[PDB]
Design a protein around this ligand. Sequence first.
Ligand SMILES: CCCCO[C@H]1O[C@H](CO)[C@@H](O)[C@H](O)[C@@H]1O
Length: 158
Amino acid sequence: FACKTANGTAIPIGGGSANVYVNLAPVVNVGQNLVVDLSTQIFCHNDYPETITDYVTLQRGSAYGGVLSNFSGTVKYSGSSYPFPTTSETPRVVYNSRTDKPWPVALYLTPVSSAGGVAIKAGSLIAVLILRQTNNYNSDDFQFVWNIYANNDVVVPT
Ligand SMILES: CCCCO[C@H]1O[C@H](CO)[C@@H](O)[C@H](O)[C@@H]1O
């Protein structure tokens, strides 16, 4: 089991960490959503589906910078929504194919009432999402840490 990002940066068997750069809507008003869909950014595959079943959860999701201070939101994982920052580990998603499959996680963020101006700075860390991978084969328990960075400023009209 290993993963790779849209631009090809990968985290090998055993886990590790990688940065994911995302382009964000430049203008987001209070009452509107800023959707950060990682399903088009992070992909993983099972290296031995003939024998092993891989289990993948969103172990933890944390907010940073402009997202931590100016937005409120939830994280959608494999069809279900949870609080973000996360309060617990999500249920497992099975990976049983050698073909790359998307990691079904998306952040649904919305400006807080007092949000205004540059709510998110270009190049800043907005979130850290931890993908935890285990299996039905051995004691492997690995973390694939995804550091989500904003490619541009996000402005909230005042
Ligand atoms: C006998 C071969 C083991 C290959 O081990 C690697 O691939 C499998 C299947 O994806 C993972 O469950 C495991 O944690 C490693 O990432």
